[PDB]
Structure 1
């Protein structure tokens, strides 16, 4: 049924993402979400694919939804901060990278981001 099929779609999406097939990844994750809309990982993965396509608004929306489902999803904050930085929403980006560091203090991407964003906030 739907939940099990949703996971197969996620796996196909992951393989597409690993092969840099960002649009095919979006398509599979979109089907995964249609089949099961209550899994934060599907939204967070779809945000990842959207980032590589420079679909920053869609990435941001997916990250916000992922957080609604699971507020401790670290990658949702990293990805949303990335999108927000692209969209020159620097204080919001810095807030997301700061939250990622609350959840995961050793995260190097987020540490690097905070240093870079100081000049804009």
Structure 2
């Protein structure tokens, strides 16, 4: 059914993403989401493809939807954080990088980011 097709589309997205086919990835993930709109990982993955395209607003909206579906999605915070730091919104980035560390204390990406953001906040 569509539930099963959705995971197939996700997996095709992941292959596209791994080969740097960023638009193809976006398009697979869009279809994944159209078939199953209640999966935080599908949105979080699409954010990642958008980040690579410099589509930062779209990445943010997607990380923001991923958190609605699942508050504990670590990568949604890391990725929204990155898009914000890219859009020079350093206060908002730090909040997200801080929250990722609340969920995943050892997270190396959030700790590197906090240190870099310190000298802008």
TM over 0.5: yes
Q: How does 1:82-97 map to 2 (within 5 A)?
A: 82-97=82-97
Aligned to 1:21: 21
CA-atom RMSD, angstroms? 0.5
Alpha-carbon distance between aligned partners in 1 of 2:91 and 2:38, rounded to the nearest angstrom: 29
- In the alignment, the residues of structure 1 paired with residue 89 and residue 2 of structure 2 have an alpha-carbon distance, to the nearest angstrom, of 37
CA distance in structure 2 between the aligned counterparts of 1:108 and 1:32, rounded to whole angstroms: 29
1:112 — aligned with what? 112
Question: Which digits, 9 at most, give the CA deviation of each residue in 1:97-121, with x for residues without a partner?
Answer: 0000111111111101001101222
Deviation at 1:2, TM superposition (A): 1.1
1:77-105: CA deviation from partner (whole Å, max 9, x where unpaired): 00000000001111000000000011111
Runs of 4+ in 1 over 4 A off after TM superposition: none
Partners of 1:108 and 1:45 in 2: how far apart? 19
Partner Cα separation in structure 2 for residue 94 and residue 4 of structure 1:
37
Give the structure-2-normalised TM-score.
0.98
TM-score by length of 1: 0.98
Give, in whole Å, the separation in 2 of the partners of 1:61 and 1:3.
23
Provide the secondary structure at the position in 2 that maps to 1:120. Answer: coil
Q: 1:33: Cα distance to partner? A: 0.4
SS of residue matched to 1:80: helix
Question: C-alpha offsets along residues 47-88 of structure 1, whole Å, 9 cap, x if unaligned?
Answer: 000000000000000000000000000000000000000011
List per-residue Cα deviations over 1:21-59 (Å, max 9, x = no partner): 111000000000000110000000000000000000000
